[PDB]
Structures are given as structure tokens and as C-alpha cells.
Design an enzyme around this catalytic site. Sequence first.
Site, PDB file in Angstrom:
ATOM      1  N   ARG A  74       6.308  -1.221   5.249  1.00 31.56           N
ATOM      2  CA  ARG A  74       4.970  -0.820   4.784  1.00 31.56           C
ATOM      3  C   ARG A  74       4.011  -1.959   5.175  1.00 31.56           C
ATOM      4  O   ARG A  74       4.264  -3.159   4.879  1.00 31.56           O
ATOM      5  CB  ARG A  74       5.065  -0.647   3.242  1.00 31.56           C
ATOM      6  CG  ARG A  74       3.735  -0.350   2.528  1.00 31.56           C
ATOM      7  CD  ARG A  74       3.072   0.885   3.033  1.00 31.56           C
ATOM      8  NE  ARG A  74       1.963   1.324   2.138  1.00 31.56           N
ATOM      9  CZ  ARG A  74       0.718   0.871   2.201  1.00 31.56           C
ATOM     10  NH1 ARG A  74       0.397  -0.026   3.139  1.00 31.56           N
ATOM     11  NH2 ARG A  74      -0.233   1.374   1.389  1.00 31.56           N
ATOM     12  N   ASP A 119       0.651   3.938   7.759  1.00 34.60           N
ATOM     13  CA  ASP A 119       0.936   2.613   7.273  1.00 34.60           C
ATOM     14  C   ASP A 119       2.413   2.310   6.991  1.00 34.60           C
ATOM     15  O   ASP A 119       2.731   1.262   6.388  1.00 34.60           O
ATOM     16  CB  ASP A 119       0.032   2.215   6.080  1.00 34.60           C
ATOM     17  CG  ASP A 119       0.152   3.149   4.942  1.00 34.60           C
ATOM     18  OD1 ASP A 119       1.273   3.827   4.884  1.00 34.60           O
ATOM     19  OD2 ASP A 119      -0.700   3.153   4.018  1.00 34.60           O
ATOM     20  N   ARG A 148      11.038  -1.067   0.857  1.00 34.20           N
ATOM     21  CA  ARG A 148      10.300  -1.210   2.118  1.00 34.20           C
ATOM     22  C   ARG A 148       9.966  -2.629   2.403  1.00 34.20           C
ATOM     23  O   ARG A 148       9.589  -3.406   1.501  1.00 34.20           O
ATOM     24  CB  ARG A 148       9.001  -0.346   2.100  1.00 34.20           C
ATOM     25  CG  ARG A 148       9.236   1.114   1.770  1.00 34.20           C
ATOM     26  CD  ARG A 148       7.970   1.946   1.790  1.00 34.20           C
ATOM     27  NE  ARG A 148       7.066   1.464   0.744  1.00 34.20           N
ATOM     28  CZ  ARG A 148       5.894   2.027   0.445  1.00 34.20           C
ATOM     29  NH1 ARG A 148       5.462   3.086   1.067  1.00 34.20           N
ATOM     30  NH2 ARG A 148       5.092   1.432  -0.423  1.00 34.20           N
ATOM     31  N   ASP A 150      -4.365   0.553   3.385  1.00 38.30           N
ATOM     32  CA  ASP A 150      -3.968   1.918   2.904  1.00 38.30           C
ATOM     33  C   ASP A 150      -4.546   2.921   3.846  1.00 38.30           C
ATOM     34  O   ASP A 150      -5.771   3.035   3.947  1.00 38.30           O
ATOM     35  CB  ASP A 150      -4.496   2.096   1.448  1.00 38.30           C
ATOM     36  CG  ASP A 150      -3.919   3.358   0.749  1.00 38.30           C
ATOM     37  OD1 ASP A 150      -2.771   3.691   0.997  1.00 38.30           O
ATOM     38  OD2 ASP A 150      -4.665   3.915  -0.073  1.00 38.30           O
ATOM     39  N   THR A 151      -3.669   3.685   4.475  1.00 35.05           N
ATOM     40  CA  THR A 151      -4.104   4.859   5.244  1.00 35.05           C
ATOM     41  C   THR A 151      -4.058   6.076   4.373  1.00 35.05           C
ATOM     42  O   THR A 151      -3.239   6.154   3.480  1.00 35.05           O
ATOM     43  CB  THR A 151      -3.232   5.113   6.483  1.00 35.05           C
ATOM     44  OG1 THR A 151      -1.812   5.051   6.182  1.00 35.05           O
ATOM     45  CG2 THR A 151      -3.460   3.978   7.504  1.00 35.05           C
ATOM     46  N   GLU A 162      -2.804   9.678   3.244  1.00 36.50           N
ATOM     47  CA  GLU A 162      -1.538  10.379   3.411  1.00 36.50           C
ATOM     48  C   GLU A 162      -1.882  11.526   4.414  1.00 36.50           C
ATOM     49  O   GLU A 162      -3.023  11.950   4.613  1.00 36.50           O
ATOM     50  CB  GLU A 162      -1.048  11.006   2.108  1.00 36.50           C
ATOM     51  CG  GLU A 162      -0.794  10.039   0.968  1.00 36.50           C
ATOM     52  CD  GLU A 162       0.265   8.959   1.293  1.00 36.50           C
ATOM     53  OE1 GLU A 162       1.253   9.297   1.979  1.00 36.50           O
ATOM     54  OE2 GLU A 162       0.111   7.769   0.856  1.00 36.50           O
TER      55      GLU A 162
HETATM   56  C1  LIG Z   1       1.187  -2.392   0.390  1.00 38.23           C
HETATM   57  C2  LIG Z   1       1.997  -2.534  -0.922  1.00 38.23           C
HETATM   58  C3  LIG Z   1       2.364  -1.422  -1.682  1.00 38.23           C
HETATM   59  N1  LIG Z   1       3.133  -1.701  -2.775  1.00 38.23           N
HETATM   60  C4  LIG Z   1       3.503  -0.551  -3.714  1.00 38.23           C
HETATM   61  C5  LIG Z   1       2.287  -0.329  -4.661  1.00 38.23           C
HETATM   62  C6  LIG Z   1       2.253   1.175  -4.807  1.00 38.23           C
HETATM   63  O1  LIG Z   1       3.066   1.594  -5.992  1.00 38.23           O
HETATM   64  P1  LIG Z   1       3.028   3.152  -6.481  1.00 38.23           P
HETATM   65  O2  LIG Z   1       3.991   3.941  -5.587  1.00 38.23           O
HETATM   66  O3  LIG Z   1       3.607   2.966  -7.882  1.00 38.23           O
HETATM   67  O4  LIG Z   1       1.680   3.649  -6.409  1.00 38.23           O
HETATM   68  C7  LIG Z   1       2.837   1.726  -3.479  1.00 38.23           C
HETATM   69  C8  LIG Z   1       1.713   2.166  -2.575  1.00 38.23           C
HETATM   70  O5  LIG Z   1       2.283   2.577  -1.267  1.00 38.23           O
HETATM   71  P2  LIG Z   1       1.876   3.771  -0.534  1.00 38.23           P
HETATM   72  O6  LIG Z   1       0.368   3.625  -0.253  1.00 38.23           O
HETATM   73  O7  LIG Z   1       2.754   3.698   0.668  1.00 38.23           O
HETATM   74  O8  LIG Z   1       2.064   5.018  -1.402  1.00 38.23           O
HETATM   75  O9  LIG Z   1       3.585   0.640  -3.011  1.00 38.23           O
HETATM   76  C9  LIG Z   1       3.522  -2.990  -3.159  1.00 38.23           C
HETATM   77  O10 LIG Z   1       4.211  -3.154  -4.201  1.00 38.23           O
HETATM   78  N2  LIG Z   1       3.237  -4.083  -2.448  1.00 38.23           N
HETATM   79  C10 LIG Z   1       2.461  -3.863  -1.328  1.00 38.23           C
HETATM   80  O11 LIG Z   1       2.106  -4.908  -0.698  1.00 38.23           O
HETATM   81 CA   LIG Z   2      -0.851   5.238   2.114  1.00 36.02          CA
END
Ligand SMILES: Cc1cn([C@H]2C[C@H](OP(=O)(O)O)[C@@H](COP(=O)(O)O)O2)c(=O)[nH]c1=O
Ligand SMILES: [Ca+2]
Length: 129
Positions: A29, A15, A75, A34-35, A37
Site C-alpha cells: 500500500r 494505491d 500490506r 489515497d486514491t 476506490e
Molecule cells: C496508507 C496507510 C493505510 N493504513 C490503514 C488505515 C486504514 O484503516 P481502515 O481499513 O480501518 O480504514 C486503511 C486505509 O487503506 P485503504 O485506503 O487501502 O482502504 O489502511 C495504515 O495503517 N497505515 C498507512 O500508512
Molecule cells: Ca484507497
Amino acid sequence: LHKEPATLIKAIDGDTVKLMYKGQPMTFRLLLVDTPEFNEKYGPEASAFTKKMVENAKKIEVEFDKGQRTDKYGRGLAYNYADGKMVNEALVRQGLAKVAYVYKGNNTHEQLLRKAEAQAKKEKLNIWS
Ligand SMILES: Cc1cn([C@H]2C[C@H](OP(=O)(O)O)[C@@H](COP(=O)(O)O)O2)c(=O)[nH]c1=O
Ligand SMILES: [Ca+2]
């Protein structure tokens, strides 16, 4: 929403992808998914699926939603298209991502993706197997 040009710099995982957008390298991103890890079950398969989709494409596009365009990690938050096919939707349809991270005002394609998720779940694909 509008599709805008980008070029592939490098696949990262299911993702996230590194693209050049307006001439600048950025990690994107994918919205609304959510994929797993890479170290989790289906993680490697999700990574490979996205990698193949973006590497094989002739034309990469990104489409921002109405809200936040970058997240707290810097991102870019977008829907990504490979030769006109939405990567976000394709991952969900194949049972390699869940619909997730649905924030108000960046959720244009939510119901398109939930419809794909229902179909993948019906077929018992991958995550839903
Ligand atoms: C997809 C997405 C993730 N995020 C943030 C929430 C999550 O915070 P935390 O890192 O505090 O958990 C993280 C999840 O991404 P990843 O799934 O890439 O880890 O990215 C956003 O803020 N907006 C978004 O639209
Ligand atoms: Ca992920």
C-alpha cells in the site's frame, strides 16, 4: 531512506500493487496517499495510471520509511519507484490521489507530496476539477 529492489507481480488498484520483495509475494500500500476506490469517480483512472506506470517500468523499487513497514492487513507500507519516478508523487501530481494517512514517523516525503498536491489543485486536475 534507501531504495530496495522488487519486481512486479500484478497491478491491483490506484494505491496498491502486488510485488515480489526479498523473494516473497507481498501486497504494498503506497505511503501518504489515497486514491479513489475502483467503484468511485477517478478510481478507474487512478488504477490505470498506476498499472501503466508499474507495468512499463524496467526497474521497480520500494523504499520503506522510518516507522511501521507493514499495516494491520499485512500490506507493506512503502514509497514505490518506477524507473526512478515515485509513483506516490506522480499520482498526487496528476490529481489522481490526495495526500492522506500521514502518520508520525512514516512521513519523510510528506512535504514533497503536499507540494505536488498544491500544483495539481492549481491546475484543477482530475479530483480537483
Ligand atoms: C496508507 C496507510 C493505510 N493504513 C490503514 C488505515 C486504514 O484503516 P481502515 O481499513 O480501518 O480504514 C486503511 C486505509 O487503506 P485503504 O485506503 O487501502 O482502504 O489502511 C495504515 O495503517 N497505515 C498507512 O500508512
Ligand atoms: Ca484507497
